[PDB]
Design a protein around this ligand. Structure first.
Ligand SMILES: CC(C)CCC[C@@H](C)[C@H]1CC[C@H]2[C@@H]3[C@H](O)C=C4C[C@@H](O)CC[C@]4(C)[C@H]3CC[C@]12C
Ligand SMILES: *[C@@H]1O[C@H](CO)[C@@H](O[C@@H]2O[C@H](CO)[C@@H](O)[C@H](O)[C@H]2NC(C)=O)[C@H](O)[C@H]1NC(C)=O
Ligand SMILES: CCCCCn1cc(-c2cc(=O)c3c(O)cc(O)cc3o2)c2ccccc21
Ligand SMILES: [Ca+2]
Ligand SMILES: [Ca+2]
Ligand SMILES: [Zn+2]
Length: 775
């Protein structure tokens, strides 16, 4: 019934003994004396010279008594003021080669310092307003920025951070959520968020406790001031080895709060950024007091950035739809449209998005069926994610009615938007000294954090080892996956006369730079060699899985000879039974065909004939052919001209269940008419070259540069409002919106790339997780 000596305990209490927890206020279960005993504030949070040696007065917020550090409740500045010790920030950075921890510490403790809406750019704008944060960044390990997940909202990103899962896998797909199985709605305000049914995956505090590592409460009630959070964590860290947690978490509502009201770049942002730094100096001044400042690994990390957004730049559905009253919309920086199923006869998904498509000359949102959203967002495979999505342009909002400024800043946009980028910093013995690392995605932190705790990570969407360059120790050693299916290498097995495919034609080492892609599923494929390209032909999918070729910088482009314009030749190396039939494409009136290796980049007039081989043909819609033709005839040579050659790996992807995973033969829903030939949901291409552009791609002795895409194989070009103009106007913009990581293609193909490079597997992993933003 009382909180005496019970304040901020870690005791797991189901009913009934009343509560003194860090979250007792959010639950309303605080024992009554929590405010007086636990939420002390008297005499502030910093020692003054007059308070030094003071007799202990329990009522003071913190203590400057000589018994204070025996009790572990000194103000964080006790030794600075009282014992004449230097502020951590004023001390010069010294490398922490080994963790200098008290005896009995089994693990280097870990502290996660989370900050809401910390734009990556704030770091510069504040080298002098954030002296403590800047010493952690300069002397520890830091990235220029960290990519948040989409939606770039607080809960999806904080839980992604806790799980290493995309929102669609852990289920916090948004700050607000309807779940049809539950018939219930989740909101940032309410007690529904406290129900465990919403929270999938395995968050870091569960991974640790299940493995015998104790955790402090990652969640703080807002009524608990930040200073008191720093004192509690510093107090948990003084507990005996039995009770002492290994991992801790501090959260700041700032600067998201001020970035919302005043905007991201207001001069008013400064003092928020300074308040945060003082809370860092309190933690590091606190840690140094405990002589834990060279023992604890500290992570400074945000959830998302802040963008200039005002209620003035708001598109209203009522201007595009007829029955805005028969729809539910999750509004703002992203759109989700569901049917108000009651009074909802007229609601038809197809009519809705047609009415929202390219209706205004400068439409600041695009409709999207979730499945057609860019694959790099991985935002479709959850029942809480509505089919209809509105991808809103940065700096804009979407709302139902004009009747829905108080805010100059907001966020939630696409996660490639630079204003949505956030910060990561690592400081401590397991982290690297004075070291910098490339921007990485926040789905990879979970593995690093398990590593820093010696925890076996739960299955997640990070690529374990992609971030080993962050750490001096706690090494996780990645191993290349093993080839499941092995390639058959066919020869001239059959005769041109044995083929009755209805295919007609007026016939008459350099390309596999980084080794053969591994096929990591059970199938039957043939490596096919040609002058200009190499391919792995799926006898199951009657198409190549991968097609690899190299186009040098000086390469010439050539037109399709008009006598071969509709030429499809039969490959003697592969069975009539394991080949497509041109007849199918004739019958299929909406389906046409394309080629993985472009005939435009043939090396000779004679070589070009290979490009017309039936084993290089794939189902392509006439609308997509516009996109692919442009990429093949124009952009490859352009990339080669810019990057001093490029190796290219193109192919099909099948993901009708939009799970981001290779489709099985049964998962395929669309085939060519009367054919066993599958229609891909997307086409991919991996474009690689030497990061050192003075070295051609084929003679590259160092790091690699890649850009990749997963272009959607759509029967129309309605995604492109400028599709009517020349492809010079729209194609590349489309391909930029569907930038992809090689990793993302590996999942969608079951293929493993870069297995035969000169680089370490760690580097290559880092390379497969890279996403070319074009921002
Ligand atoms: C009102 C705000 C100040 C706080 C909101 C807190 C809420 C999001 C947090 C508080 C307790 C959290 C759960 C707790 O850690 C136990 C686990 C079990 C694990 O398997 C999945 C996650 C889960 C349920 C946490 C979910 C988030 C919770 C409810
Ligand atoms: C993100 O991680 C989850 C966790 O593994 C992946 O979902 C699992 O995938 C495996 C492999 O196919 C299945 O055996 C599991 O059944 C899946 N999860 C569950 C709960 O069943 C998910 O595929 C990953 N996402 C991506 C895009 O790779
Ligand atoms: C290794 C994992 C690191 C992530 C830590 N992490 C902190 C959360 C947090 C804590 C609060 O105290 C809080 C608040 O006081 C007000 C508010 O609006 C939101 C708030 O969220 C949070 C939530 C969901 C998943 C993860 C989380
Ligand atoms: Ca990954
Ligand atoms: Ca799939
Ligand atoms: Zn947030």
């Amino acid at each position: 019934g009382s909180c005496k000596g019970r304040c901020f305990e870690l005791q797991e209490v189901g009913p009934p003994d009343c509560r003194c927890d860090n979250l007792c206020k959010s639950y309303s279960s605080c024992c009554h004396d929590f405010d007086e005993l636990c939420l002390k504030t008297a005499r502030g949070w910093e020692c003054t010279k007059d308070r030094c040696g003071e007799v202990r007065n329990e009522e003071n917020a913190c203590h400057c008594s000589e018994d204070c550090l025996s009790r572990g409740d000194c103000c964080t500045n006790y030794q600075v003021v009282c014992k004449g010790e230097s502020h951590w920030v004023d001390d010069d950075c010294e490398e922490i080669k080994v963790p200098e921890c008290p005896a009995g510490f089994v693990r280097p403790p870990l502290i996660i310092f989370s900050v809401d809406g910390f734009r990556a750019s704030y770091m510069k704008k504040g080298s002098k307003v954030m002296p403590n944060i800047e010493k952690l960044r300069s002397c520890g390990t830091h990235a220029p920025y960290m990519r948040p997940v989409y939606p770039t909202k607080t809960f999806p990103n904080l839980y992604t951070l806790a799980t290493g899962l995309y929102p669609e896998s852990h289920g916090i797909v948004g700050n607000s959520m309807y779940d049809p199985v539950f018939d219930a709605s989740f909101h940032l305000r309410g007690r529904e968020k406290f129900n465990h049914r919403w929270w999938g995956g395995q968050p870091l505090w569960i991974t640790a406790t299940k493995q015998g590592v104790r955790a402090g409460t990652f969640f703080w009630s807002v009524s608990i001031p930040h200073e008191r959070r720093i004192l509690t964590i510093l107090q948990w860290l003084s507990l005996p080895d039995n009770e002492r947690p290994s991992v801790y978490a501090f959260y700041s509502e700032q600067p998201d709060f001020s970035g919302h009201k005043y905007g991201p770049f207001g001069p008013e942002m400064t003092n928020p950024l300074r308040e945060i730094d003082k809370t860092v100096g309190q933690l590091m001044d606190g840690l140094k007091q405990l002589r834990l400042h060279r023992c604890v690994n500290v992570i400074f990390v945000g959830d998302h950035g802040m963008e200039d957004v005002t209620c003035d730049r708001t598109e209203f559905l009522s201007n595009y739809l007829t029955n805005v009253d028969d729809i539910t919309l999750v509004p703002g920086t992203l759109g989700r449209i569901r049917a108000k199923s009651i009074n909802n006869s007229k609601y038809d998904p197809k009519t809705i998005i047609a009415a929202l498509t390219c209706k205004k000359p400068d439409q600041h949102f695009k409709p999207y069926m979730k499945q057609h959203l860019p694959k790099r967002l991985h935002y479709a495979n959850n029942r809480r994610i509505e089919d209809i999505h509105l991808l809103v342009d940065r700096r804009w909002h979407v709302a139902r009615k004009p009747l829905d400024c108080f805010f100059q800043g907001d966020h939630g946009f696409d996660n490639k938007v630079n204003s949505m980028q956030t910060v990561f910093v690592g400081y401590g013995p397991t982290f690297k000294y004075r070291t910098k690392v490339p921007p990485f995605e926040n789905i990879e932190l979970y593995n690093v954090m398990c590593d820093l705790l010696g925890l076996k990570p739960a299955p997640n969407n990070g690529t374990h080892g992609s971030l080993n360059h962050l750490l001096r120790t706690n090494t996780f050693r990645p191993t290349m996956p093993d080839e499941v299916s092995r390639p058959n290498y066919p020869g001239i097995m059959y005769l041109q006369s044995e083929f009755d495919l209805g295919c007609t034609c007026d016939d008459k080492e350099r390309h596999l730079l980084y080794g053969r892609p591994a096929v990591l599923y059970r199938t039957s494929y043939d490596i096919l060699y040609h002058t200009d390209f190499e391919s792995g032909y799926s006898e199951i999918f009657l198409m190549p899985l991968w097609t690899s070729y190299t186009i040098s910088k000086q390469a010439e482009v050539s037109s399709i000879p008009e006598h071969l314009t509709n030429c499809v030749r039969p490959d003697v190396r592969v069975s009539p039974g394991f080949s497509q039939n041109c007849l199918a494409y004739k019958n299929d009136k909406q389906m046409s065909y394309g080629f993985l290796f472009p005939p435009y980049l043939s090396s000779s007039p004679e070589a070009k004939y290979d490009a017309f081989l039936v084993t290089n043909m794939v189902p392509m819609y006439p609308a997509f052919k516009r996109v692919w033709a442009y990429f093949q005839r124009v952009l490859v040579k352009k990339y080669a001209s810019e990057r001093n050659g490029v190796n290219v790996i193109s192919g099909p992807i099948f993901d009708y269940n939009y799970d981001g995973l290779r489709d099985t033969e049964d998962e395929i829903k669309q085939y060519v008419e009367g054919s066993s030939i599958p229609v891909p949901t997307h086409y991919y291409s991996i474009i690689t070259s030497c990061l050192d552009f003075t070295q051609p791609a084929d003679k590259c002795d160092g790091p690699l540069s890649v850009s990749s895409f997963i272009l959607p194989h759509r029967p129309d070009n309605d995604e492109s409002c400028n599709s009517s103009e020349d492809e010079s106007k729209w194609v590349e913009e489309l391909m930029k919106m569907h930038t992809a990581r090689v990793r993302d293609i590996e999942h969608l193909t079951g293929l493993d790339f870069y297995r035969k490079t000169s680089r370490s597997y760690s580097e290559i992993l880092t390379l497969k997780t890279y996403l070319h933003t074009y921002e």
